[PDB]
């Protein structure tokens, strides 16, 4: 679907979509939010996949 | 007053604020004591029902 | 030894502050396979000493800004972990409240960081003219954007109503004189209309020659002034097709302004006190507000 959206036109001009530097703050996460992240399913799945 | 109060105090034994870390208020042990009356100036006194 | 690879990559980044591609690293160190270089770059990014950029030429690895230091008292960690979004904001600036909320730090720590950064000339605090609530912090090297601060009309966070009024009056007088000259020429209707027309560049150069104020007024400023005049119902603008000329502002288009008289004189409703009455809704035959004992009509008939 993404490829179709891109090929909506026959010839696609060179897009000036340079990746601006969107480096986000490594904000200090609250202990509650950190525990929520640790208890999240994605974190457990990634930890299992690390092996 | 002898068991459940201690468990409730232990559940909230530590309370701290997000700003200015390394600051905390830790509860150690809670007591109820005997019935008293605050009539006297800054002094307690046994009072009957 | 991957430590030597990381050290060499850091040295190469030091040599090129703008960043280095994988081809440069391969040319500088050809005896190392691509997998080892990839692992080294992954470790460098994990430990937080490199940043990745996606340019039209590919990927660039740049050393993180650590040499540029304004707040060395304490730890450079918070220094850079504030300067990061300070730079990200850049021209548009950012209020102290937003910096605090993005840093998740108390007010005292961020205040200290900002003061120490201002001490060594890394950030400048300018008053937000749009909403004068707090001072936004920007990079000292970047030019302040006109929208968030500054402007030809705003002077010290104060709108100059007198300045815009004088500009409008002078532009209207110039356009009226031009239209009068065009009408008096009476050479040909088309020539008359073309002469009564005034291009934005012409009126801009005229205002510049007048020199009412010291601040430099760009062409778009005079264009906005003429648009405001049009909104006043006193002038008319037309977009003609012209490829290139002394203006060269818009591609193939030129805006010509001319003083035009109103459509109709004041109507009859406004000539009666009833049409300009602010308590017209409460009008009633028998009551406190009655046309018989009206003060507006009384003063209007007495005058
Ligand atoms: S107060 Fe008199 S003049 Fe004013 S709107 Fe009423 S009737 Fe008309």
Curated annotation (Swiss-Prot), chain A:
Annotated spans, Disordered: 1-18
Coiled-coil positions: none
UniProt-annotated location(s): Nucleus
Superkingdom of the organism of origin: Eukaryota
Cross-link Glycyl lysine isopeptide (Lys-Gly) (interchain with G-Cter in SUMO2) placement: 19
Sequence positions bearing Phosphoserine: 9-10, 40
Membrane-spanning ranges: none
Subunit structure: Component of the RNA polymerase III complex consisting of at least 17 subunits: a ten-subunit horseshoe-shaped catalytic core composed of POLR3A/RPC1, POLR3B/RPC2, POLR1C/RPAC1, POLR1D/RPAC2, POLR3K/RPC10, POLR2E/RPABC1, POLR2F/RPABC2, POLR2H/RPABC3, POLR2K/RPABC4 and POLR2L/RPABC5; the stalk composed of two subunits POLR3H/RPC8 and CRCP/RPC9, forming a structural mobile part that protrudes out of the core and functions primarily in transcription initiation; and additional subunits homologous to general transcription factors of the RNA polymerase II machinery, POLR3D/RPC4-POLR3E/RPC5 heterodimer and POLR3/CRPC3-POLR3F/RPC6-POLR3G/RPC7 heterotrimer.
Function statement: DNA-dependent RNA polymerase catalyzes the transcription of DNA into RNA using the four ribonucleoside triphosphates as substrates. Specific peripheric component of RNA polymerase III (Pol III) which synthesizes small non-coding RNAs including 5S rRNA, snRNAs, tRNAs and miRNAs from at least 500 distinct genomic loci. Assembles with POLR3D/RPC4 forming a subcomplex that binds the Pol III core. Enables recruitment of Pol III at transcription initiation site and drives transcription initiation from both type 2 and type 3 DNA promoters.
Protein name (database record): DNA-directed RNA polymerase III subunit RPC5
Swiss-Prot record, chain B:
Known disease link: Leukodystrophy, hypomyelinating, 8, with or without oligodontia and/or hypogonadotropic hypogonadism: An autosomal recessive neurodegenerative disorder characterized by early childhood onset of cerebellar ataxia and mild intellectual disabilities associated with diffuse hypomyelination apparent on brain MRI. Variable features include oligodontia and/or hypogonadotropic hypogonadism. Charcot-Marie-Tooth disease, demyelinating, type 1I: An autosomal dominant demyelinating form of Charcot-Marie-Tooth disease, a disorder of the peripheral nervous system, characterized by progressive weakness and atrophy, initially of the peroneal muscles and later of the distal muscles of the arms. Charcot-Marie-Tooth disease is classified in two main groups on the basis of electrophysiologic properties and histopathology: primary peripheral demyelinating neuropathies (designated CMT1 when they are dominantly inherited) and primary peripheral axonal neuropathies (CMT2).
Protein family (similarity comment): Belongs to the RNA polymerase beta chain family.
Protein name listed in UniProt: DNA-directed RNA polymerase III subunit RPC2
Domain of life: Eukaryota
Complete-protein stretch covered: 51 to 99 of 1133
Subcellular location, record wording: Nucleus; Cytoplasm, Cytosol
From Swiss-Prot, chain C:
Binding site for [4Fe-4S] cluster: 274, 277, 283, 294
CC terms in the record's Gene Ontology section: cytosol; nucleoplasm; RNA polymerase III complex
Documented effect of changing residue 37 to W: In IMD101; uncertain significance
Subunit structure: Component of the RNA polymerase III complex consisting of 17 subunits: a ten-subunit horseshoe-shaped catalytic core composed of POLR3A/RPC1, POLR3B/RPC2, POLR1C/RPAC1, POLR1D/RPAC2, POLR3K/RPC10, POLR2E/RPABC1, POLR2F/RPABC2, POLR2H/RPABC3, POLR2K/RPABC4 and POLR2L/RPABC5; a mobile stalk composed of two subunits POLR3H/RPC8 and CRCP/RPC9, protruding from the core and functioning primarily in transcription initiation; and additional subunits homologous to general transcription factors of the RNA polymerase II machinery, POLR3C/RPC3-POLR3F/RPC6-POLR3G/RPC7 heterotrimer required for transcription initiation and POLR3D/RPC4-POLR3E/RPC5 heterodimer involved in both transcription initiation and termination.
Connected disease: Immunodeficiency 101, varicella zoster virus-specific: An autosomal dominant immunologic disorder characterized by reactivation of varicella zoster virus (VZV) infection in adulthood after primary childhood infection with VZV. The viral reactivation manifests as central nervous system vasculitis with stroke-like episodes and lacunar infarcts on brain imaging. Features include headache, hemiparesis, impaired balance, and other neurologic signs.
Taxonomic placement: Eukaryota, Metazoa, Chordata, Craniata, Vertebrata
Keyword DNA-binding attributed: yes
Protein name as it appears in the record: DNA-directed RNA polymerase III subunit RPC6
Gene expressing this chain: POLR3F
Subcellular localization, as worded in the UniProt entry: Nucleus
GO molecular function, one term: 4 iron, 4 sulfur cluster binding
UniProt remark on domains: The [4FE-4S] cluster-binding domain adopts a globular structure that serves as an interaction hub that connects the POLR3C/RPC3-POLR3F/RPC6-POLR3G/RPC7 heterotrimer to the Pol III core.
GO biological process, one term: transcription by RNA polymerase III
């Amino acid at each position: 679907e993404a490829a179709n959206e891109a090929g909506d036109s026959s010839q696609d001009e060179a897009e000036d979509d340079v990746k601006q530097i969107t480096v986000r703050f490594s904000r200090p996460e609250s202990e509650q939010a950190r525990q929520r992240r640790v208890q999240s399913y994605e974190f457990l799945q990634k930890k299992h996949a690390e092996e | 007053i002898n068991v459940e109060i201690k468990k409730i105090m232990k559940a909230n034994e530590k309370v701290t604020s997000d700003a200015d870390p390394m600051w905390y208020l830790k509860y150690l042990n809670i007591y109820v004591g005997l019935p008293d009356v605050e009539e006297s100036f800054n002094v307690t006194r046994p009072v009957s029902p | 030894d991957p430590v030597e690879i990381e050290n060499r990559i850091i040295e190469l980044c030091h040599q090129f502050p703008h960043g280095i591609t994988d081809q440069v690293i391969q040319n500088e160190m050809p005896h190392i396979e691509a997998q080892q270089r990839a692992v080294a770059i992954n470790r460098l990014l994990s430990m937080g000493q490199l940043d990745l950029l996606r340019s039209n030429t590919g990927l660039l690895y740049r050393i993180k800004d650590s040499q540029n230091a304004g707040k060395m008292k304490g730890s450079d960690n918070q220094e850079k972990l504030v300067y990061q979004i300070i730079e990200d904001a850049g021209n548009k600036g950012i209020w102290s409240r937003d910096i605090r909320y993005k840093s998740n730090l108390p007010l005292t720590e961020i205040n200290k960081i900002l003061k120490n950064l201002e001490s060594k000339k890394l950030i400048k605090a300018v008053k937000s003219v749009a909403a004068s609530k707090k001072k936004v912090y920007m990079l000292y090297n970047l030019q302040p954007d006109r929208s968030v601060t500054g402007g030809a009309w705003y002077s010290d966070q104060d709108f100059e109503s007198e300045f815009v009024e004088v500009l409008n009056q002078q532009c209207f007088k110039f356009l009226q004189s031009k239209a009068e000259t065009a009408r008096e020429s009476k050479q040909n209707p088309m020539i008359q209309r073309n002469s009564s027309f005034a291009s934005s560049h012409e009126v801009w150069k005229y205002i510049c020659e007048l020199g009412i104020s010291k601040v430099e007024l760009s062409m778009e400023d005079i264009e906005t002034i003429l648009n405001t005049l049009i909104y006043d119902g006193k002038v008319e603008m037309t977009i003609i097709a012209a490829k290139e000329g002394t203006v060269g502002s818009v591609d193939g288009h030129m805006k010509l302004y001319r003083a035009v008289n109103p459509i109709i004189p004041p109507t009859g409703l406004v000539r009666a006190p009833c049409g300009l009455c602010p308590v017209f809704d409460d009008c009633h035959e028998g009551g406190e507000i009655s046309p018989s004992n009206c003060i507006y009509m009384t003063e209007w008939l007495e005058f």
